[PDB]
Every structure is written in structure tokens, then in C-alpha cells.
Amino acid sequence: SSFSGKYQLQSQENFEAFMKAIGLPEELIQKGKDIKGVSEIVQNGKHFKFTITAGSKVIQNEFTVGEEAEMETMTGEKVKTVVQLEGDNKLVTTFKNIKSVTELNGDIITNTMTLGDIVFKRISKRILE
Amino acid sequence: SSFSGKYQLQSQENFEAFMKAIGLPEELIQKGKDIKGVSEIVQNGKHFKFTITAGSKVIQNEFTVGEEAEMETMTGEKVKTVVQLEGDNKLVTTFKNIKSVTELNGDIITNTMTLGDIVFKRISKRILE
Ligand SMILES: CCCCCCCCCCCCCCCC(=O)O
Ligand SMILES: CCCCCCCCCCCCCCCC(=O)O
Numbered sequence: 001s002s003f004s005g006k007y008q009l010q011s012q013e014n015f016e017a018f019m020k021a022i023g024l025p026e027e028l029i030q031k032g033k034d035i036k037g038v039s040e041i042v043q044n045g046k047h048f049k050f051t052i053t054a055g056s057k058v059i060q061n062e063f064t065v066g067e068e069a070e071m072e073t074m075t076g077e078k079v080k081t082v083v084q085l086e087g088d089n090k091l092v093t094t095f096k097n098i099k100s101v102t103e104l105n106g107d108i109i110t111n112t113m114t115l116g117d118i119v120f121k122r123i124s125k126r127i128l129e
Numbered sequence: 130s131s132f133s134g135k136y137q138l139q140s141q142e143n144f145e146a147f148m149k150a151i152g153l154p155e156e157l158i159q160k161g162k163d164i165k166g167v168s169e170i171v172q173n174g175k176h177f178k179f180t181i182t183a184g185s186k187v188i189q190n191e192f193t194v195g196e197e198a199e200m201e202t203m204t205g206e207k208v209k210t211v212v213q214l215e216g217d218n219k220l221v222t223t224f225k226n227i228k229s230v231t232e233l234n235g236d237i238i239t240n241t242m243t244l245g246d247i248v249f250k251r252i253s254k255r256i257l258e
Pocket of ligand 2: 136138167168181182183188190200201202203229231238240251252253
């Protein structure tokens, strides 16, 4: 129903391979790979505000599902894409050659980002306030 | 008693003035000045692990109070300093020309950094888990 909340990263798979493939500087990969930070989502209907801790960067994006949005990626590049709702608990988007699926299951969020043969997967858990 | 917790930034003063004074690019200042993120402290006796959300950057430092440690600053520079514990609720250190005081009262942390005539103050509140 609602994605809103604060989520702490629990585990992730293939961070280094994915970050190398998108061209992140090696120095930012090494300092960011072991950080387990907190991301915050604010949902108002179809409108989303994301404050994402990804490695050693904080990225803030907003968008409305189904509307074209301009989004900052991990490299700082801005991309124009549309985020779709699949079901009621999955956000799905494509940009460049990446497919991103954000799936909510109770207190667990799983983000899966596929780039060619690399699947970068983040599992986070809702902070219970 | 214990600093351990996740702390969400509530308010801050002189973020822009401090970041300009230490040489951060205006681009990074504008990106980060409105972010109200979560920082995490883990205390075990004299040992502290910090995961700090500072603007658009996440910085992860670790130190034992009273021992010289290398700490990453906002500029990416690693400084060697000693942090001391004053009482049970104040962390005090000085590096370059900055004095930093981190004070815990109840569930509120007040961080005050003084650089010349600029007092950079951050007020953050413990997330009640
Ligand atoms: C679509 C690009 C957004 C920014 C790219 C950063 C790479 C990681 C994105 C994961 C954010 C998904 C939100 C769930 C919480 C989390 O995993 O932090
Ligand atoms: C002294 C090394 C750290 C350098 C980073 C400076 C940016 C502000 C640091 C304040 C963190 C203090 C912990 C309380 C929580 C917070 O304010 O995020």
C-alpha cells in the first residue's frame, strides 16, 4: 500500500561489479562498498520522494509514477524516464540499459538492478519508530 | 551514557557558510544543504563507529577516544587527531583550525563546529527504535 518509511540496508550483492560497469570511479567504489546507510521514501499517492544512501553518496529524486521524470543516477548524470507501478508493491523503470525493480514486502524492500549479466541486489529493512 | 543510535537531522545553522569556508564546491553545497538525513553512531566503551550523512556525502569514521586516529573530513582530507570524551556525553576534538564538540542530552545530539567566526551547528534527534 505505502512505500513511505526509513529503510536500513541489510545486504547487497554485486555492488562492485555494477558500479564498475556504470563507470563509477574506483576510489568511490572502495569507500562506498561497506557502507550500510539509511534511505527514506515519502509517498503521496503516485508521487514519490526518495533520499537514497548509495555507497558514499546521497541522492535525492522525485517523481510521479506514469509521468516523465528527470532523475539523478549514481554517476551524477540526469536521465529522463518513466517509473511504472507493477501491481501495488513494485516500482519498475528502465533507463539507459538498466532495469530497476523496487519491491516492497511488508518491512523489507528489495531493489534489483539488472545491467546485462549483472544483477545488483539491495535488501533493506524498515526502521520501526 | 551511550551515544549509540540512529539520529535524524532536525535543523542546522551555517551549513553553507562553513562548507564554503573549508573549500567545498558551490555545486556540492547547493546539492546537500537541504538534505536531512540519518547518521548512525555505535559506541562500545571508548570505541566509536560513525556513519555520518553530511549533505550529499556519507562519511564513515572509526576511533577510540584518547588514541590518535585518522579521520576523513568533508574535503576528503584525512586528518590525524585525538577525540576526547568529556564526562559521559561530550566528544571534543580539534583538527586544522576547527573545534568540534558533540554533545548528547537525552535523545538530542548537538554538534557545534567552530571555524573562525563561523559556528556550524547541527541538531539531531535519536530515532526511537
Ligand atoms: C534509478 C537510479 C537512482 C539512484 C541510483 C542509486 C543506486 C541504488 C538505488 C537503490 C534505491 C532504491 C530504494 C530502496 C532503498 C535502498 O536500497 O537504499
Ligand atoms: C571530524 C570528522 C567529521 C567531519 C564531517 C563534518 C560534518 C558534520 C559532522 C557532524 C556529525 C556529528 C554526529 C551527530 C549526527 C549528525 O549531526 O549527523
